[PDB]
Design a binder for these strands. Sequence first.
RNA 1: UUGGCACCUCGAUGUCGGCUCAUCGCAUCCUGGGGCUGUAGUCGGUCCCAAGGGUUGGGCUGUUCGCCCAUUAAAGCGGUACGCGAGCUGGGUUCAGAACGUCGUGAGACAGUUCGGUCCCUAUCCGUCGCGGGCGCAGGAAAUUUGAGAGGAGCUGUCCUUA
RNA 2: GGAUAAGUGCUGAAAGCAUCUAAGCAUGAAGCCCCCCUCAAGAUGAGAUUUCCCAUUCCGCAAGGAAGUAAGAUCCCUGAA
Lengths: 37, 206, 142, 175
Amino acid sequence: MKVRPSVKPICEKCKVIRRKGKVMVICENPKHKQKQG
Amino acid sequence: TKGILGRKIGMTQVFAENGDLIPVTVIEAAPNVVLQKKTAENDGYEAIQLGFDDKREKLSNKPEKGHVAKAETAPKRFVKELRGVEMDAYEVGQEVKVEIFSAGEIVDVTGVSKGKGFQGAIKRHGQSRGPMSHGSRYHRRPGSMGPVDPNRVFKGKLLPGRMGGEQITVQNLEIVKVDAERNLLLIKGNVPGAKKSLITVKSAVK
Amino acid sequence: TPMANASTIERKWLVVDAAGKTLGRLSSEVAAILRGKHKPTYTPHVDTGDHVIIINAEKIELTGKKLTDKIYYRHTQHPGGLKSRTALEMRTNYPEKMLELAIKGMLPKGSLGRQMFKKLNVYRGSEHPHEAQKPEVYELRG
Amino acid sequence: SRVGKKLLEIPSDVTVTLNDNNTVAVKGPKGELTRTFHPDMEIKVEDNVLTVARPSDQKEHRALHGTTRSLLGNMVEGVSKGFERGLELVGVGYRASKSGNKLVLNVGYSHPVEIVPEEGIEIEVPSQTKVVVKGTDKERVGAIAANIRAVRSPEPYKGKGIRYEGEVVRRKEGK
RNA sequence: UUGGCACCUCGAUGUCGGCUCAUCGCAUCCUGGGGCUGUAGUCGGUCCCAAGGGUUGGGCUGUUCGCCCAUUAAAGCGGUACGCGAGCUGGGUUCAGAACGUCGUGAGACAGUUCGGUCCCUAUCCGUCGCGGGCGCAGGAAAUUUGAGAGGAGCUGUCCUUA
RNA sequence: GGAUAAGUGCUGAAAGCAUCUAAGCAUGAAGCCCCCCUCAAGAUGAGAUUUCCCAUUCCGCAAGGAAGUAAGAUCCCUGAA
C-alpha cells in the first residue's frame, strides 16, 4: 500500500473508490494502490 | 477424565529397564470411596466426592456419619470432589483404586505447598538484594514502593508475608509404577507438599 | 406543611418487556418509577418507588454502530487492570448487567439509590419467577 | 441504463414461491434455492416473468432494487444451468486428485493439502492440473474457488500456483 | 531537549549518576500477521495492524551520553518531581583546608583543574503485603462446592527431515 | 476454540461496466474472551448440595425477654507437617 492523506489517482486507469467510509485507490498497478490513514 | 487422591510419603530412586535413574515420589492411596454423585439438575454440575481415610468415631461427627452412611463405609478425613469425569461409570459406595492408572500415563497432581512462614521479599518473590559492602546500609529489602505522582502505592507490589500453604498443581508428570497390593503409586519426580499430606492425582489436562 | 411519607407505602410490582426497546429511553422511565416520581406521595428520602421486573433483556435494541463501537470499560485497582466489553457481547453473554449498569447510572447515588436499585430484578427471557407477588404490566409512556 | 428496472423470465422447469413476505424459494432440475430479501422491496411474479419494484428513490432503495434482480437472475441461472468455475495451475510437481468427494493437492509444500466441498457443491478433476468447481450459487462457488486459490496463489516471476482460467497474471523479471 | 514567563513552594519541595523496585505510553528493537518493491532465492528496504512477553555481560570515564570487545532473536524510544535518598550509596557537582595555571596592587576570584571532606528521624493516617477477631447472610451446626469477579502465566534460539 | 485488527476476498448494486460494500456471506495475528494455574459468597445480590439437631422450661396479655440445653464448638493441655 501507499498510506497517505493526499490520496489521488496517478494514471488514468487508477480508480478512486470509498470503502468502510475510507477513501482508497484501485489500479492493476499495485504501486498505485493507496489509502488514507 | 479420571482421578484419585491419597497421601504423600517420600521420595527415592528407581531404575527403568536400564541404568536410568528416576527420582520418584511415593504415594499411598488406600482405596478411595465415592460418597456423593452430583448432578446439574440439583447441584448445577456433574461431579463426585471421594473420601480417603478411616477415622475414629471419637473424631468424626454425626452429620459426617450420615453423609457417609448413605454408603456402607466409615467416616473420612480427606474428602474432596472431582469434576468433569464420566458419571455413569461411578456409583456410591464404589471404591476406586490405583489400578486405574498404569506405568506410563501422564498426570496432573495437586497438593498443598509447605509452610515457610513470614518470609521476606527475596525468598518469597525472588528479588535481588542490595550490595553488602561499599557503604551500603541496604540489603535484604524489597525496593522502592513506586513513584511520587500518584501519591500512593500500586497494588501488586510484592512484600513479605506468610510464604507457603498454597494449593499447587504440577502438570505433565508421568507415572512410573503401581503396587495395588500395597495401594501405592510411584511417580516420576517431585510434588508440592510435606510428608503425610494430601495429594490429589488426576488424569492430565492435556 | 404537607405530608412526608413514612411506612405508609404500598409497593406494587410491575413488569416490562423489552422486545424492541432502546435501553436508555426505557431505563429513564424504570428508574423514575423505582424512585417513585410517578406517585403523588413522593418524598426524596423514603424510597416510595415500586418494584420492577424486566424480561427478554437479550432482546433490547440500539441505534447506530453501538454493538460494535460502544464499550463498557471497567478498571480494577491494579495497574493495567483496565478491561473492556462491547455492548454486543454484553448483550449475548449477560444483558442483565448492562441494563443494571445503565439504570444504576441514572439512579441517584447513596444508600437510598442503592436500596431502590435493590427493588430491580432483571431476567433474561420471559420466565418471571415472581409470580407470587401478583404483578401487573407497565407499558412505557415513551 | 438500469439493472433492477429490468425483468427476469422464468423459462421452464422452474417454480418460484413467496413462502412469506420475502423468503423466496426456487426449484428446478439442478436443485433449489432460497433467499430472504429486504421487506421494503416489492416482488411480483407474473406469468413466466418476474417484476421488481421499490417504493422510493434513495441511495438504499436504488441499490437494493438492482441487487435483488441481479441476485435472482443468478439464482434461476444456477437452478437451470448451474454455475461453474475453472482453475488452472502451473508448476512442475503441481497437481491435483481426489479422495472421494474431497479434493487433494500436491503443489509445493512438505505436506499435501485437503479440501472439503461440504455444501452440495461438486468438484471435477478432468486433468492432473485443471480443476472445476460446480454448483448453483455464485457466492459459494467463488468462495470455494478463492479458498483454493489462496492455497498457493500465483507468483509474478514465474506464473505458478492456482490460476483462474481467465486470469491476467502480472509479470516480473527475475534478476 | 535548549529555552522564554515568573504562577505554588525560600516559617526549607534535597539537586546529577548508580543500586533495588517496578509501572505506563507506542511514534515497535525482536517475536506474530500483511501490502508494495528497483521483492529471483537466502537476506533485505519501506509502509500498515499489533505494547502479550522479552529487550545481555564487560573495559574507559563520577558520569548520563558516547567509543570499544564479545554475544544476542533483539541489545527499542520515552513518561512517572530528567520515577524512586523518612528505600540505599554519595563518586561528581556545591561550604570551611591546601595547591597549580591565570586574573587582580591586594584581600580574593574562575561552568578552569587537582587532593581531602559528618547523608538525622521509634511510621500516627491513607496506601501496599500478610494475618486474626467481631457481626451479618430470618433457626442453630459439620463438610463439599458453584462461580460473578480478581490475579498469575504468557519469551525464544539451534539442529534433523521435508531437501 | 470463538469473535476480530491490518490484509485478503466471494456475490453485488448504487453508477447497464467495474467495484471486498451500502444489503448479504467468509477468511484472517505472539493481540481480545476462553482453554491452563491460583484466590474467590462481606458476590450485604451474602448463593447451591449432603448430612445432624429438635422445636424444651420460666415470665410476659401479646410484643418480646432469660435460662438451662441438643447437634456442635471452645477454654485448658500434649505437640508440629
